[PDB]
């Protein structure tokens, strides 16, 4: 079975699966955990940076795409770079040509369409990375989950990566609670850190290990690392 | 060259002179400037003969393929193809085309595509060097919903004048009647229209 | 300015009785300055002869080109090209550069090895074939040559006679042209042999 239908993306299995795409998804899981949640005024990204050695850094997992948009990555870093960069251009284009900030919903459509291309043509490989996009546009706070399959979804909150299932259940519970953390950033963040810890196990989120990013009504997407997050550990 | 297309109660009529010149010499005195792009969509050509013939030929091609796939095209669509060619290649074309077609729903329709490549839908349209001389007359004598016989007269008189003053025009006056009845070819010789 | 008048030169060809003659001058100058007195303008590929007047660089380029084409032709065809055929090759080769021509005026002369018939032809710079039975002229002194030929020519001349006629046609025309002369060479061609003589002419 599978072994004969997983040689490349252009092949369908007898049941209708695209194993290469599936194996790509498998790289997301092996990736460190990250979480995103939004109220009606803000949206927050809390990502757990992973380290190789105790002599190595905790590889950055949050990329800014424009003053009003950003995302967190879980999987192959290079692929996130490629994709984030593409998004940065789409945002830029929208501004320069139409003097309009790119709708988060539309950024999602662009990401889906770009990924889909690497799953129908010979030679290419799917993207091996998951993305969580947050942003404040002409219709408020937004949170998007991007899967290499090409499937992009808008949620109130969510998480991806290893043990990501913990945070996701926690948020599926805390829903009614954080969704109302309007006007208060520090609360939405804390609410996020309390979701990300729901997927810990190995250690505890240190200072040079925690990474948070936020955007909203009067907050240009910004990223906090280290001392900046100390007050959240 | 003097050409015109007039919409009336039962459809539409296209008329033209039959003179093509290269300088003061009349290369052809029995020219047929009334070209068929489709069964019930014809056009009047003015300007570069080479250009208008080539343009027409390409349009006829497009409408023939259009028909193969989507049935009979509207007169508006025929106009859009001419327009697309004239506009897009404005720098290398010298064509003034009048497009006239007969629809069963829209009855008669006339579109004029001047030099720029812009499109104009009108009750009737006149074009060609001779047209300048009959702007006054045509404006004063045109009425909507005229009868076939009336319209054939309007065109016949107008063109006879255009031919009278413009040296680039002359020969015979050809016409094409487009109605639900089908297609009718008309011709009028000098001896008749000169003394109108 | 006019490429066909930078270097100067003339070529003429005539048909006789079972023979053909082709002659040219030896001048090669640059405007008024004469430079070479040995620049010949007649070449041959097998038994087919070609004379090229016009821009020197093109005269040379075309010869090299035709040597090239005739060589391959023989390797494939396994026989040397005939006047008629070569003429067609010249024509198409020239028109191939229709919008950036060679500034030459070619003349073909030879006898069909199969039918023994004499053959001469001329073309303009873009290749239009001018096939004449009597004579073909070309060069900066072409008007003079037309004058000489039209008068001094008569059918079926014999090799020794055609020679006298062609040489007098070339010689006297070249002398009414500031850009031609400075030497001259005539080719008398027959089925079995070909003689090449250098004429003695004014050196001014």
């Amino acid at each position: 079975f599978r072994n004969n239908y997983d040689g490349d993306t252009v092949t369908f299995s007898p049941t209708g699966r695209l194993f290469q795409v599936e194996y790509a998804l498998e790289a997301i899981k092996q990736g460190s955990v990250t979480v995103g949640l939004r109220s009606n005024t803000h949206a927050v990204l809390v990502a757990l940076k992973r380290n190789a050695d105790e002599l190595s850094s905790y590889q950055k997992k949050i990329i800014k795409c424009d003053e009003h948009m950003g995302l967190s990555l879980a999987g192959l870093a290079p692929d996130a770079r490629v994709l984030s960069n593409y998004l940065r251009q789409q945002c830029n284009y929208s501004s320069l040509v139409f003097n309009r900030k790119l709708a988060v919903e539309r950024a999602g459509h662009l990401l889906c369409d770009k990924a889909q291309k690497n799953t129908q043509s010979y030679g290419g490989r799917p993207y091996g990375v998951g993305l969580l996009i947050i942003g404040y546009d002409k219709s408020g706070a937004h949170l998007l989950e991007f899967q290499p399959s090409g499937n992009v979804t808008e949620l109130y909150g969510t998480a991806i990566g290893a043990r990501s299932q913990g945070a996701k259940t926690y948020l599926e519970r805390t829903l009614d609670t954080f969704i109302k953390i309007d006007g208060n950033p520090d609360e939405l963040i804390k609410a996020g850190v309390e979701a990300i810890s729901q997927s810990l196990r190995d250690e505890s989120l240190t200072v040079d290990n925690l990474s948070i990013a936020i955007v909203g009504k009067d907050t240009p997407f910004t990223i906090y690392d280290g001392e900046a997050v100390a007050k959240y550990i | 060259t003097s050409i015109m297309a007039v919409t009336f109660k039962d459809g539409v009529i296209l008329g033209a002179d039959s003179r093509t010149t290269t300088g003061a010499y009349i290369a052809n005195r029995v020219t047929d400037k009334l070209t068929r792009v489709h069964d019930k969509i014809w056009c009047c050509r003015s300007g570069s003969a080479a250009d208008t013939q080539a343009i027409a030929d390409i349009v006829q091609y497009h409408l023939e393929l259009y028909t193969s796939q989507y049935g009979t095209p509207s007169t508006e669509t025929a106009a859009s193809v001419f327009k697309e060619l004239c506009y897009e290649n404005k720098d290398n074309l010298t064509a003034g085309i009048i497009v006239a077609g007969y629809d069963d729903k829209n009855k008669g329709e006339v579109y004029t595509i001047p030099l720029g490549g812009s499109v104009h839908k009108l009750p009737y349209a006149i074009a060609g060097s001779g047209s300048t001389f009959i702007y006054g007359y045509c404006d004063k004598n045109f009425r909507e919903n005229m009868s076939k016989e009336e319209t054939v007269d309007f065109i016949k008189h107008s063109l006879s004048q255009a031919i009278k003053w413009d040296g680039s025009s002359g020969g015979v006056i050809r016409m094409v009647v487009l109605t639900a009845a089908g297609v009718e070819r008309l011709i009028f010789y000098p001896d008749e229209y000169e003394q109108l | 300015s006019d490429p066909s008048s930078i270097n100067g030169g003339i070529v003429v060809a005539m048909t006789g009785k079972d023979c053909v003659a082709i002659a040219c001058d030896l001048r090669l100058g640059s405007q008024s300055l004469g430079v070479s007195n040995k620049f010949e303008k007649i070449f041959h590929y097998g038994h087919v002869f070609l004379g090229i007047t016009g821009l020197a660089t093109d005269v040379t380029t075309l010869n090299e080109m035709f040597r090239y084409k005739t060589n391959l032709y023989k390797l494939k065809e396994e026989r040397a090209i005939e006047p008629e055929t070569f003429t067609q090759l010249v024509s198409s080769s020239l028109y191939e550069r229709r919008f950036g021509p060679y500034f030459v005026g070619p003349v073909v002369a030879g006898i069909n090895s199969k039918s023994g018939k004499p053959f001469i032809a001329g073309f303009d710079l873009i290749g239009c074939i001018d096939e004449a039975k009597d004579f073909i002229v070309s060069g900066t002194a072409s008007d003079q040559l037309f004058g000489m030929c039209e008068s001094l020519y008569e059918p079926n001349l014999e090799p020794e006679d055609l020679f006298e006629t062609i040489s007098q046609a070339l010689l006297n025309a070249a002398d009414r042209d500031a850009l031609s002369g400075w030497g001259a060479v005539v080719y008398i061609i027959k089925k079995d042999e070909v003689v090449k003589r250098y004429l003695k002419m004014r050196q001014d």
Binding site: - | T20, Y25, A27, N28, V30, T31, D32, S48, A49, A50, Q53, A54, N92 | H44, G46, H47, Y95, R98, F99, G122, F123, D124, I126, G127, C128, I129, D130, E131, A132, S142, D143, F146, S151, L152, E154, L157, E160, D161, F163, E164, T165, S167, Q168, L171, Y187, E193, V194, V195, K196, R197, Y198, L199, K200, M201
Partner: protein, 222 residues
């Protein structure tokens, strides 16, 4: 150049003079301006010589190949469509003006084509610097329903108007008749009204007249 085309009750005929010129000098006193596009489709061309020649052969080539592909006789309208689209493409830079005629499975046809790619249809046509002299004649004698012999006369006369009245035309008259049922008949030098009178003297030179400096045999054999 002077070329004409005349339709007659059962076909069409085309004629042309035989003078070729470079500036005011006559280069060829008898060249053939009548070209065969296909066995029964002939073409008469004026304008840039090399152009009418090349364009004529090219389309002739394609017509032949098209004939073999479709297993049908070539149609004049096809030679007409190919010729014009080719000429148009070149914005008039290929100075070829032609009168194309012939008979095919659909009847007898007469057309004219200009270097820019525009085409005309008619019962009688003329092109060339002799165009007007000829057209004057045609506009004076043409009538509907001409017999093959009447057409040949009318055409032959039109080309003459050119020879005599136009400096760009002269020498002989060539004709080609295409009749709906038979083979096309080419009539090279159907008229030769300009034979040069015998020269007042002979200019044959006494051998030895020309001074030679060197001599030698040339190697033709490889």
């Amino acid at each position: 150049t002077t070329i004409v085309g005349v339709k007659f009750n059962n076909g069409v005929v085309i004629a042309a003079d035989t003078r070729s010129t470079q500036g005011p000098i006559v280069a060829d006193k008898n060249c053939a301006k009548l070209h065969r596009i296909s066995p029964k489709i002939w073409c008469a061309g004026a304008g840039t010589a090399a152009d009418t020649e090349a364009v004529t052969q090219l389309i002739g080539s394609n017509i032949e190949l098209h004939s073999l592909y479709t297993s049908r006789e070539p149609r004049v309208v096809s030679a007409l469509q190919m010729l014009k689209q080719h000429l148009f493409k070149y914005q008039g830079h290929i100075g070829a003006y032609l009168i194309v005629a012939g008979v095919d499975p659909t009847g007898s046809h007469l057309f004219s084509i200009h270097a820019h790619g525009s085409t005309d249809v008619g019962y009688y046509l003329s092109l060339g610097s002799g165009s007007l002299a000829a057209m004057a004649v045609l506009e004076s004698h043409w009538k509907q329903d001409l017999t093959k012999e009447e057409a040949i006369k009318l055409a032959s006369d039109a080309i003459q108007a050119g020879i005599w009245n136009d400096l760009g035309s002269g020498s002989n008259v060539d004709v080609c008749v295409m009749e709906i049922g038979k083979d096309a008949e080419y009539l090279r030098n159907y008229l030769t009204p300009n034979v040069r009178e015998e020269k007042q003297k002979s200019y044959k030179f006494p051998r030895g007249t020309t001074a030679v400096l060197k001599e030698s045999i040339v190697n033709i054999c490889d």
